[PDB]
Amino acid sequence: SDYARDNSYTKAAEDIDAQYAYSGNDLGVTYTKDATTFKVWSPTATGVKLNIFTKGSDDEQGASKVASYTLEKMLVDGEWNGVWTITLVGEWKDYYYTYSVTTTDTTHIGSDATKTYETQDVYSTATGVNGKRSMIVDLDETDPEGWSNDSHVLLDKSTKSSVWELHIKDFSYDKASGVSDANRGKYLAFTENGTTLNGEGKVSTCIDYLKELGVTTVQLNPFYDFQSVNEAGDDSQFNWGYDPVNYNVPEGSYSSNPYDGKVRIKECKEMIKALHDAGISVVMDVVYNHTYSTDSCFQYTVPNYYYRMKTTGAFSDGSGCGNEGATERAMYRQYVIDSLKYWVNEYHVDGFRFDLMGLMDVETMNMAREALDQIDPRITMWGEGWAGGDSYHPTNTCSGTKFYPATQANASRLSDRIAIFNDGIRDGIKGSAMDISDVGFIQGSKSSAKGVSYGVRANSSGTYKWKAQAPSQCVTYDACHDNATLYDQIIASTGLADYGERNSEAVKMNRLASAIIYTSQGISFTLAGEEMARSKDGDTNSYKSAANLNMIKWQNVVDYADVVSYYKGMMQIKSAFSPLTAMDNSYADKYTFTKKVSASTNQISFTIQNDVEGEWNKMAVIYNNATTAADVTLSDTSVTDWVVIANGETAGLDSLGEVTGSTFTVPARSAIVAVDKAGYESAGIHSSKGKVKVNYVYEATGEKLEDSVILQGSVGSGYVTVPSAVIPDTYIVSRIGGNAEGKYTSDMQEVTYYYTDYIP
Template sequence: MRTTKKLMAAVLAVCMLASTSVVSGFAATTDSEPVSADIAADTTYTKACEAIDNEYAYTKRDLGATYSPDSTTFKVWAPTATEVSLNLYATGSDTEEGAEDIGTFPLEKLMDGEKWTGVWTTTVEGDLKNQYYTYTITAANTTGTKTTTKETQDVYSVATGVNGKRSMVCDLDSTDPEGWENDTHVLLDESTDSSVWELHVKDFSYDPASGVSEANRGKFMAFTELGTTLNGEGNISTCIDYLKELGVTTVQINPFYDFQSINEMGSDSQFNWGYDPQNYNVPEGSYSSNPYDGNVRIKECKSMIKALHDAGISVVMDVVYNHTYSNDSCFQSTVPNYYYRMTKTGLFSNGSGTGNECATERAMYRDYVIQSLLYWVNEYHVDGFRFDLMGIMDVETMNMAREALDAVDPRITTWGEGWAGGDSSHPTKTCTGEKFYPATQANAAKLSDRIALFNDAIRDGVKGGCMSISNQGFAQGAKTSAPDIRYGVRANSSGRNKWLASAPSQCVTYAACHDNATLYDQILGSTGLASYGVREATAVKMNKLGGAIIYASQGISFMLAGEEMCRSKDGDTNSYKSAATLNMIKWQNVVDYADVVSYYKGMMQIKANFSPLTCMDKSYQDAFTFNDTQRTYSNQVAYTISNNTEGEWSKLAVIFNSADTATDVTLADTSVTDWVVIANNESAGLDKLGEVTGSTFTVPAYSAVIAVDKASYETAGIKSDMGKVVVNYVYESDDEKLDDSVVLQGSIGTGYQTSPSAAIPDTYEISKVEGNVTGKFGETPAEVTYYYKDYVPESILNADFNGDGNVNVMDVTAMQKYFVGDIQLSDEKVAGLDLNYDDAANVADCTMLAKQIAGYRVAEGTVVVNHYYVDAEGNQQQLTASETIVGRVGSDYSTEDFKVVGYAADKDNYPAKASGKIPYGATLEVNYNYIESSLDINLHFKHNGSLTWAPTLWIWGSDLKGVDKGNYTPDDSAEWPGVAATDEDGDGWYEYNFTYRGAGTYNVIVSNKGSTQTIDYKGFVDNEMWVVIDDSKLATEEFLTFYTDNPETNPDAPIAKQITVGK
């Protein structure tokens, strides 16, 4: 006990002497990332941990369970503990067959001469292979103010049982899959050669259309299935084979260490991203075929990595050393309050936004992180790491980790998020005495230039600010985003734009990742061009433009898995625990968006063959010539790049046009007058698509043009090894194109499958197809043409009124005779006389049939929906813009009333044709009329976690023109942050009621007295809502869910709709 008393005395001394002064202000932030305070302060808690580091930092590499067939030695670092015992079990949980408590063994202090090391140890004789164990630890917290006794798994676990609560004694050699001894790292000489595809283990293969066996879907072993094809049909490759054909060099896999949010005993349908660590050095059990056997997850994880290596693909592991799932972790149970940062008031610092943050500046956690990285590199052959919320970690630890990885191989990649998720409290110095610097974008210059940071500036520049799916970026036509694109083209390394990278190697260039909206969802959500997941021609062009920007820029190129096939998550901007069926990659998209997949393939080839775009350093920063200054707002970004690399193209011209019309752009660099186009609005790659003479290019709307100087294109001889299929969509009556042609490309001998155009309205239908709809890419380009004819309404097809078996002019005559009373028709024939679906049989139907027979189009009809109210002066006004429905004549349509506060549809004057069949001829108008309705609004708010702060509300209105009008917290004289809701009955629901003025919608911001603020939630119309505050999402700014009924009493409570008025 002497050494423990010595430690406690030192702790108490620093408790009395500690200062709590704050010595630094705010960390660097961006417009899009959560604003977080970097609070450097030396407190009671930091001083106590410094004392522990100084006295008991342990540097040997033998913590955990060291196994041999003869005995196993257990060592646990617990310098504040007074008692530690080992518990052995036959199984990983008490619910399994054969569960048995094998025994309990006391641990003793490990001494180094007369000095205690802070380590407890015991050796158990015999072969303990595959037995499970925990420690029971009685320990004081770092300041000696509280003692706890906890049973916990080993901090240094390498194997666990089901759900990770018991560690397992493991013979790691026995977990190697067949051929593991021949597996080697797949590393790139330069990190900027990377084309990264970010995936999730379950997303990758959960779709039944993936062709993966049912048993392996969503599992590690899905990666080992070779030759998988779409729906198992044998033509279109999926999974591993698809990745090889796509041409990515690297996969970044969302966390596949053991995380806590999934019940490994539960259903395979459970889903979580995995950013909730439980056991850092153990693979996740739910991805294995048997989570109960600690060996299986290890072997199958290695099998996944080997399969990717066999495909020539590098594996980057997403790691989350900045926080754990909860404060009730093995770290906290072993050395209470040591591994976590604490505020000066004794609360867990929450820079992660998840309730805690880990203290990388402390000697033993720093060492743990570095050794964990090395463990994954050496034991699992991982090739690189992505650091979640790296801004919570300190610069010194990150640089030390980089040095440790360099000792293995300097080509191992490292990148991370250069921001935090909330206010981070940390000491002023690290355990070495050096000043603490957070590993943020602001401190990029202090980090190794081979620790890259995600460039959120170009991300938001491409698609719009990520904190709202309604934000538009350059791809959707936002001129103000052009500066983000220009700076991002040189990887933010040639001028500060929110932050400055030391070199291209320090920048991850991307448009989307697992966080926030997918690129395609953001395009649709911000433009309203179509519903989520629907192919829309202009949105597809914008997606291609986004891809062109990323791959025509310097830095480490990165995309979310499926971005190249217009992946959608139905607008879900935070799908971390949404259904697996929503998150999964929908492999049918490989066919439905084959042209976009092909475009991305081509862009990756362009970048890979042009050294100025793949260089790690700034040697080419002056090789760029831009048309405009970096800060110019414009729908066009144009530049040329000069290249002196032998055997490559000498000059590349790149033009992005995000205007909604084609634009002529003249390059500022006029040194070249003959160009070969290698990328346009339809295709991208290494092949010649056309030539341009002079310096002026016509760039179609929402597209890119990339060209190479003709002389070097011809001398370099860089050619594509891919085959091509051109798909045309033609109106057969005049051979005019109904939609742009698409170009598919793929490796010779691999399969292709074409599909009809989703952009051609259903008033046309396919009449024939020339060429092979499916087949294999060959040396010679192939062509497939879909021919379309006019849709013929069902009523016309059945218009044989004279009974001769044909529909022709004689039937027009029969109709005319019937209408004038010259002939009689059967009841069946009479019922079919309403050819134009206007609910009347008359001469207009004769006219329609005559037009059809004469060759005129009668396929299309129109319905217009209007919404009217009467204002105070008695004048009829439009409540919102009319809606026009265009579709096949005779097809069903349906409409619904429009909802705003203050007006409701007059049920006594409801339109007779609110639904029906689309007519031919005159436009059908559906008119809704509105009367005044209740203006009283009742709101209820409740936390879904342990937090209890009263939501502060800022609520304002938007009138029928969409203009902000009126504040309700409490009135127009309100001052930010508004008023607090109250829980007067103590049921946990905070209430706020107000009376609306005028008519329109209302908008809500919720905060905690002005901090932890939400986005602007806009467009509500319901008179009563129940709002759930998701305590786990506070860092995202989108942590509210709005219901129109109480979700506690109604599990199926509908989500409140948000509408837009005045547009």
């Protein structure tokens, strides 16, 4: 819910915006070898004092207060524009500082009831430990080697993306990642090429694993400066980071040395450079909708201005943390826009994800979208189109237009290149996020088939709980950092095994969900480690749980190499068919669904008439969430010869069979993807990945104890195969044919685990 209220705080802030608004783009430190400059926009302040130090804290050896100066009012044409400036002559690099602002609030300008605060610069670019002290860094110095040649690694269309939502700690915090001792959980785990599981050199991990999996984007969890982890305390502290402190300053606990401010910048840039060199785009999660506490730099500089104030004087609780930034405000809007531009231009990020996007206002988001477009329009923007609580915001914004929250309901006003995370498809696929045990479509819910069928088109065709101006305004996904993981939800709802423990039926549902996400329009978005069945031990909220519980268990790239390969093949499927990555609604009417989109059906099916030259001319798709195989007849009978390219066992770009007519026998809880034979033969799209088939044969009779699984990978890359974890303990591998480990050769290989009786 949201309400439009006006009060004394809003009127005073509007007057401030009308009079004192500033647009010089040079607030904060403007360091040069000749002289340093400082600027603080605070109309309500009676005086500002700058305090230079030598160490970002008093507990560091050699820490001492250097000097204090007084910042005087900045005058243009004799009138005050709200800023306090001072120039220090001489060399001042690496010198910390703070401000001592004596100020009233917005409603009491000119009165003598001031209060004195000591505050880190709102525009801090570098900070000592815990971000409580600024620093005058020379940013040109912190560029790693070859940084001048780094360029944005951007998609041509954000719908082609396969976003990998990766937490910087979890990426490498496991000792099984094989990363050096000093770099487990930092920016620099991303710069180490040649990593492997347990350093054994057999199967890759981390960055080489990313190049293998082919993800086109990686969305990094909050690595701006945040509060909830002590940058000087225990190294095992984990926190997503939704308690922002310094937006413009990289987080400190992800660097080898947080006490020095150049080190965090250097190492963050190093990580971004590493990912850009891996050909993988980088997407920064941002949280401009709130700050850690109201005792912030914004409040200490201009109280009650930068936040939305209720009529009673309390702060609005729309974000659920006790406050919420007033994005409608003439200077906070400019702050957010300039912070986005600064992150992009300095740390070479390629796109953003706005937490609780519903709080921000549509006009501000259109302004940010236009500003990022002015750099490069392929910079991807998206975010959660809701809010955490009741928001009380002004009736208008600083520009004079009405105030509209950026919600899913307002997606019609919100720009089409600002995707809204599709809760509709998320719950249609795997169930409502509010309950971990809820049963979605994949688990067997017939009713959610409507949600899945509408989300197949990015909700941009028709209306189910919301609508998108285009599929480019939809992030097709079923999991992210928030709430439980896909495999967690599947296991919890099925009740077949404990969390993270491999289960064949749950793996089938996971493959089906991957097919649903990767044959749909819009942006494909996956939780990092979602292919390998990542599990948080079922924890529905892990924002600050154990780092060893949130870390990616890198044994899962071996234990779930078949699921990794299914995902890696579905990615190729989606990238090899233009309708599955169309930005606009040109292909909305080609989806000749077999049943009504609103039908509660166990087996979803449809077909896509592609029109791009040199590609498959048609595809079928049949999601069969039933416990038993079911024959599905296509209402589109214009094509009767087909070449399956995915099924319940393996997925990819290679013919897994052929079907005559238009009737497909779809296995239980499994998807089928086909293509027209003529188009397949004429296009020439073919999988260059090697393959391995791992059977599990009871030796005495030749019957299979468990189904075979197909592994996949690039030709020339290694692999490792293991006995299936689902075979009972009463069986013992007596022999293993073929290469139980090795590399992927262009010609298919095989491995057979023969079994016999055993007494555990």
